[PDB]
Structures are given as structure tokens and as C-alpha cells.
């Protein structure tokens, strides 16, 4: 699968700067393929056979494809992904007006690198709330064009940068975003307001508040010399985002087959959805107990000048396949079965596997394997991974979704 | 004047990733307004109302507009700038390979913030020597392609990373271009062998030798809510050659005109070429004394993060105009006659000029004024400067070149 | 409201120095409304219109209206807050006899203040569990007098006590209750047992076990040049729980409204209750999604002494009303949605409110906005807060309970 594949990853980055619009993006591409849409708020409605996915705060998404078989005898298979990344957002009362420019206080979300976020052309997209004809409404607003950016201070004027320093977030990130005429009040909501607009035909009364995340202009594109990886903010996480709904799109045999994606993994849903697809009692511990978790997020691969960060025998490389992570160690995390599973799914779709344990100086109740594709740079702006691994991913992935029998 | 003055800009950079290539696109404007070459190793001859371009090591360039009046008489007007900015170059023995990867071993060039450096999509370019039938020569080469990228560290693997660290250049900076192998050979030499093939049709012999810089693929921008600044690679010195050059090539009047644009800023052609549209004796000495030389580099905006590093009263704003530069320690640097005779062109070009000493706690022997652009970012990888800055500085040094005479 | 209100919460500090008085004084105030209270061992006979409490282990309590449509169709409203603080327990084997003196070894709950303690006029107060005609009985006891005092050493034999040291809570924090007379054993259950009978009347066989708290004797108060304040213990958050009581007992409308005032925040009750109020299946679900808790803690007014500590943006006021809490790292937390839909409800109130964030340097499935009240000095002893700001929120609170309709 390419190439396409690259490609389609590219494509679905790009239209998802945030959880929201990631999620706004799965819905279309589960639409296109005839996945009717659920509100929990409704009574439901469900068929076997039904090809269903239901929202949660428009951030997180869950979708089933119910199978031929009974959950009750063969389980629900589960991929679990996030539709979150760490990032920068604007504060409830942002504007800062000093020395001739307007910039918007932000927040860190998430374990963010900082230095990478200097030096950017940035954008800002996300969620606003506000009231039009007496209504309460929100909708998805992306300004698209570079409009922010936090510069660094220059050598000459902080001459130990490349010694490190401590990154101040309060002092030190707070984007520029124009200039003032001496002259001049600075509205944010104003311009949401204006943003509104332009992006909906939408004139809002009032705008009351956001979830608005800056986000790198420089789309995700294929790098290196023979085009091995692949740079681009995000690749944490939703590149198994899209591994994993481009292998429930594509699955074959009978199982039932769940793709969940949740916001916030970086700081219910689940459980609540699946007890509303069975009848109550013992069904649902019978079903989950012959259940199975893929759970993907990226893993570190060990990186050439920082090497010594890794287990010399466990230095997961970028295109050499997923990545079976161990922390023992942890409660319902990789074990032998679920490790020993995954691992000959691998060698019956002809995919390489590695496998990672977190170095030894350095909820539902479901069986799961903690997976991760190699990765480096995790939570910067532009992250490394390598471009034959999303095909190696979505490859396991459909076999796991096409899988008789677990351990 | 508006647009077209920036997107210039962006078109120049772009086509100049190296002192070599900035070289050569001043050559090729130079030429197109009917400017002709003379070679240092041969006798010139040259004539009143002449257009001239004559260049050393294919990185530094000086372009002669010799007006009615001789030199002795009217004086040069001097706009100088540099060719070269900091910057990653390829070490003459480069080849590591580790963790199944290829990098690139490097140096540092000039005072380069590395930071900035980390996570970019980088190609290559510069100049390749080698033997063709039997024949010694050098050409360029630009790969253009993203090849190479410095991941950073994940953020879980050097957890203290936004408290900061000395970043280790030998160790941390070394780029990634490809994998390898087993036991796959990895030469350099052969790669850029077939890059001068593909660019060149050029077969070679040998690849002997080569001054190849790592660059940033993300064109310059224009950015900012209301299109204000300018963000990219080499703004420093760039951004000044092309000021220079484009108001050379416009500029009104008949005076004796010069552009000189040196390499190794950051680290005898301009005397030695001036010597030569003398006559003998006390010709020289003369001319100088009759001169002024605007010495054009980039000057520190007061940057609203870290606004305390800028003297309260000498805080520069980007978009507010050239800043003149004083230092009373030197050399041959602004003193009160260069200085007011540039503040003076100013209003009556009827632009803001700005002026800046540094914190007071932090050779031709011709006059001079030293001025810069206010820029944030200075030796970043990505810098920022005004998008109204370089038309006001092209006006002003379009007034300069058209002055007779002096203070 | 005035002023009685202030009263009104002055008298429930008054009656509540301890998680379960503060559950019998709101258990109290309900009954008098014609609340009834539910055992969790039994089988619930629910009707609309309903009115009920439950409480567990006496120290944590829901109150429960049932209005006349479903929760399926109009969901909860649900205010929750918390009857605990930081305070100096009493240890298990609590006797230090020294010096000539009686002490009782403490344990310290929650983040306490240190400092704050000593130098007051500390009672003692809680549950004491106990065996009566061979039957295991636990009642509440209230010392009333001040009994306890922990005396700091004075500046003459502690010179630098301005100059901080590091309190140590085993050694320093243990309160003298009395002299010993020596004779002379000290037995703490002997005096419990004389509290049971002074206070109850029951005359006990032996004293098991006990959660006693010290608590200061000063009443709360009005303070301020123009009454601007108010000061006392507990302000943290036995305020938001008389706020919440207050708005229960005297909303309009007749939705469906709850008020959870648990036990232990300062360290399943409300999903377990919530589960017997609705028919089998995907009715909670539904009912839940349909919902908005308003989770009312204390905020932190900006410190004009300690202005720095907060951002200048985002620096909530005394008597400016009610604060909306934004931290995106936490996953069922104000969002743009909830936050929108209770600044809206303010100024729909008339009511004025504040937004927080803190400094970028520093479960059920419910949607949520967290909002406090703005304070000083949490967890002192002695907290300050607006006397405007308890009538502020209790006609939110009140607005609220009579929404109709929901984020």
C-alpha cells in the first residue's frame, strides 16, 4: 500500500492541526464508507451487523463494526490510539500588548519540548464557543495562514544559549501575532468573532471561549536520501490514528471490531460505550474477557547520537516494525500472551517486530498488548518516523481485526 | 514596491542556500542590468559611466557603477554586506555509521544558535572540486530535496530537556541522511559523484574535496496576522545584499557607485579592487577620504519576551526603520558625521531610522556608518525581521548612492 | 441573602469543625426542608418530585431533588464540593507526657499550613467509636472549649525564626492539653469516655478508636474597613458547600438537581447513587450525557503582597465573582463548551466572573467546569474571602439548579 499510504497520512495531518479536527476528520472518511454516526444523548438504535461511531466532546471517537460473531463467544477485537499531541494553547484572557506588539498568552499541554516551538511560522486552530441568535453553539475555526510566532532570543544577546538555559513558558512563549498602532485596543474574541465569519457566514452575538492550539504551518512531508522517514508534527499520535482506521476500513472475516481514539491520553468512554452493545449481567465481563487491546502509541527507537538512552538489546530501529513494549510492571499491560500473540500475528503477515523495555536506571479489565511504532523527537513540533512503518502497522493491525482466537 | 520587493526577497534566498549561490544570483541579476565581469588575474581597462562585477572564490562579490566624475573627485558611495551566514558544513571525512544509520560528521560555522538546528527538513549545497579528464574544477551542487535531519531527543529519554543542556556538537548535531546496509558501504564522494550527473551531466574522474552547508528546505514567508514580518534562513546577511543590490541597480544620479558583498562576516578584495580604478600615488588615499562606506548588517529589535536585554531607551522595533549602530569602542565605526549624515538621508527619504548601542553591562580606512534591519532570532536557522524594513532600507541606500557628497 | 447569608454561613462554620459535623449540619438543614434520607442497604422507592439525601460513612452526603421530567430527557444538574480541609488529626496512641506537660501526637491531613497553627486557640472534635453494653457505637463529640494550644518557640531562643526554617510536624506540631500533676497517668480514652457522658449522656465500657480534629475556637467574621471580607477556618470549601445547600433548598424551576459534598478531596459514592435513580441499561448513559457538574473549590485571588505569583492576565479579584478554572491537562475539566455555558449564565445572573489559569511556569464521564471562589491564604488556619462573592455564587448556583437546558 504505498506511497498511497504516505500520502493519505500526509493528507489527514494536514487537515487535523487538533483533537478535534483529527476527529472531525475520522468521521468523514467513517461516513464515506457508510459508518452511521450515534449521539449517546439518544437512544440507540443498534442492528447486528451495524457499521456505528459515536463522539465525545467532538474530541474523542469510538467506532464499531459489529460482526457475524457473538461478542460473547469470540470477544471484540480493540485498537486504542489518541487523537491528542502536546502543544501550546491560548489562555482564557490572552492578549499582551508590550513593546509595539500584540501577543496571546498560552499554556503547555502536555509533556512539549519547548526550544522546538521557537523559530516557527504557526497557525492556530481548534474550538469556539459563542452565542448567535440566542443560541449557545461552538464550531471548528483554523486560521490556516502563519500568523504567530515565538522568535528565540538572538546569540549575541544570550551568548551561553548553546550551554542551556531554563526555557521559562510563561515568559518565553507567548507568540507574536501583530503589531499595534500606538493607537489601538487588541480584542482576541473580536477576531474569533471575524474568523467565525469568514470560515461559517456565522455572526456570533458574543464569543464566550476556546480550545485553540497553535500548530506548525510545515506540513508533514517524506525526507532522507531514499526517502526512509517521514518528519512532521503529530506523528504521536495520530499516524496510529490513521494506521488504525485505515485497517478497520479495509477489514476482512467476522470479528467484532472496535477503533478507539481518545483525546487527552497526553495529561469512561470505552466502558460506556460497550455496555450499551450488550445485553446487561455477565455479558460484558464474559465478552471482554475474551477481548483483546492493541494499544498503539510510538515508541523511542534508539537514536545514533544518544544511544546509551537505550538497552543496547532493545533499540527498537526506525522501519524495522512495531514495537512490543514491556513494563512488567504495570497492571493490564503487555504479557507473555498478549506479547506472544502479537508477536506471531507479525511473523504470519510477514511484518518484522521488535520489542523495548522502558531501561532499568531510567479501566475496563481487557487483556492488552502495548504497541508503538519507532519514533524519534517524541513530543517536539516535527517528529521522526520512518516511512515504510505505518505500512507494516496497518498491515498487523488488519490481521489482529481479522484474528480467530486470542491467548 | 510592495509585494514584489518581498517576494523578491523570498525568490533570493531561496536560490541562495550558500555564500556560493548567493554569489552567483547577485552575478546573474548584475549581468541582466548589463554589469560585465572583470577577472582579478587580468588587466582592466575600464571607462567612465562603466558597469562592473568582479569576484573572488565564487563567495564574495563587489559591483562597480562608476559615475561622470572620477573617484578623486566625487568619492565612492559603499554599501557593504556578506554573503555567508552560521551554519552546519559537511567535515572532509564525514561518513558515520551507527544503529544501522548514516549520518554526516560537521562543523559549526560562525556562531550558529544549534537548537533551532534540531528537527528541520535540511538539504545540502556548496562547492564540489574534483578531476575531470584530467581537468581540476569546482562547481555547485544543491541537492534540494529534504535529506538530512538532527532529531531531537524525546522528551521521556532526557526528561530535564526544556531546563536545558549543553548541547554537545561532535556528538548531538550529526544529521541523519539514510539507512544502511548490511554491510552496505556507505562514500559520500559517490553520492556527490552522481549529484553532478544529475545536476551537471558531469562524469569526474574523483571527487577531491568540498564547502557543503546544511540548509533549511521551509522557504522564507511572509507572517503575522497583517502580513508584518518575515521569517527565514539567512535574513542575516542576506536580506541586506539584496537591499544593496536593488538599490544599486536602480539608483538615480551619477555618483561612483559600490556593492561589496564579502564571505567570512561571521568568522584586502575591496582595497585591492579600488586601487585598481585608480591612477598611481596619492590617487587612492584621496578618493577614500572622500568616500562613506553604509556597512549593512542586522541590528537586535527589542524582542518583547526578553525585553531587558535592549537599553530601555535604544529598544529597535521591527518595521520602525533602519537602525544606526553605535559603538564609541569600534576605530572606523559610526561616530557623529556618519551618523547624522544618515539620519538626515532618512528624513528627507522620508523614513524612520532608529538608533542602538548595546547594554552598557553586556582596513581602507574609509568613513562609516554602521546600520542594520531589526531582526529577532539572529543566527537561527529561522529569523524575523519587518516585511516594510527592506523597502524602507532600499529607499534610503537608492537616496545614498545618488548623494553628492559628504559631511 | 444580605448578610444573612453571611450570618448563615458564619453559624455552619461554626457548627462544622469536622467533615462529619459539617454532614450532620447540611443532613440537618435538609430534613427541616422535608428531605428524606435513603439507606444505601436497602431498596430505593423513588418518585418524582421525590426529595432525598444519602450519606456514607457519615462524612460525605448527596441531596437529591427529583424533578417531574426524566433525567433520560433533561439530565442532572449537579453542584459538588467537599466537607474536608486540611487539619491536625489526632494519632491512634496519642499520650506524650514531658516536660510536666500532656500532649497529643498528631497526624497532618491534607496540605496544611504549618505556620498558621500555632499560637491558637485549638478544640478538638470528631468520631468516637466505642463499645456501650457490650454493642459497637460510634457518636460524635465536640470538645467546644479550647483545650489545645501549639506554642511556637520564642524569636530570644530562635533568632532567625523570620528567616524561615524547615517546620517539622512530628516534633513541633504535637498541641498541650493540660499539666500533669505527677502523681498521674494520662489516659486520652478515659477522656473521651467523660466527653460521651458530659456531652451525651452514655457511659461507655471502653473507647476503640476515634477521628478527632483540632480546630480554632475563633469564630468566623466579617473583616475589612468597609466589611469587604470575610475570615475564618474552612472557608475551604465548607463555603461552597453552604453555597450549594443554600442554592438546592431554594432553587426555582423543578429540574432534576444534585448537591455532592464528599468526604476526602483533600487526600464511586455519586456514580453508585446516580445508577439507583434511573431504569436498567443505556438510561445512564443517556442521562449523564445529557448532564454538567459545577465543581466548586476555592480559587486564589491575586496576592497584592505576592502579585508575581499569579498571571497578570488571569488574576482573579476578592468580590469579583465566581472564577472558571481552565487546565487543559486534566480530562473531564472546563472546556470551551462548559466554561462558555457558565460565563454566559453569569452575566444572564447579573453576576461578574473572573477566569484563572495558573502560571505556565507552575470518574463518571460528566462534563464539567471547575469554578472557585477567589481566596486568600488556602489552607491556612484562617482563610480570607470576599463578603460579596458567597451571594454571588449562590444566585449562579441558583440559576444553575433552574437551567433547563444544558451544554
Partial sequence: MRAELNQGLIDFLKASPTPFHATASLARRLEAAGYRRLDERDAWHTETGGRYYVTRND???????????????????????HTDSPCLRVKPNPEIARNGFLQLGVEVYG??????????????????????????????????????VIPNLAIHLNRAANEGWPINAQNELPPIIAQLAPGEAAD?????????????????????????????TQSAAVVGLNDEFIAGARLANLLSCHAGLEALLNAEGDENCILVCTDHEEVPFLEQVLRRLLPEGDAFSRAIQRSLLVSADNAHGVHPNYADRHDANHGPALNGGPVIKINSNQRYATNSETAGFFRHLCQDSEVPVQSFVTRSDMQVGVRTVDIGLPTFAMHSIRELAGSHDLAHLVKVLGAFYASSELP
Fill in 59 to 81: 474530541s474523542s471517537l469510538i467506532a464499531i463494526r459489529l460482526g457475524r460473531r457473538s461478542p460473547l463467544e469470540s470477544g471484540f477485537r480493540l485498537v486504542g490510539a
Fill in 111 to 148: 509533556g512539549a519540548l519547548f526550544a522546538p516551538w521557537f523559530d516557527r511560522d504557526l497557525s492556530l486552530a481548534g474550538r469556539v464557543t459563542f452565542r448567535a441568535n440566542g443560541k449557545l453553539e461552538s464550531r471548528l475555526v483554523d486560521f490556516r495562514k502563519a500568523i504567530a
Fill in 188 to 216: 482576541f474574541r473580536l477576531l474569533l468573532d471575524e474568523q467565525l465569519l469568514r470560515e461559517h457566514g456565522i455572526t456570533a452575538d458574543v464569543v464566550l471561549d476556546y480550545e485553540l492550539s497553535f500548530y506548525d
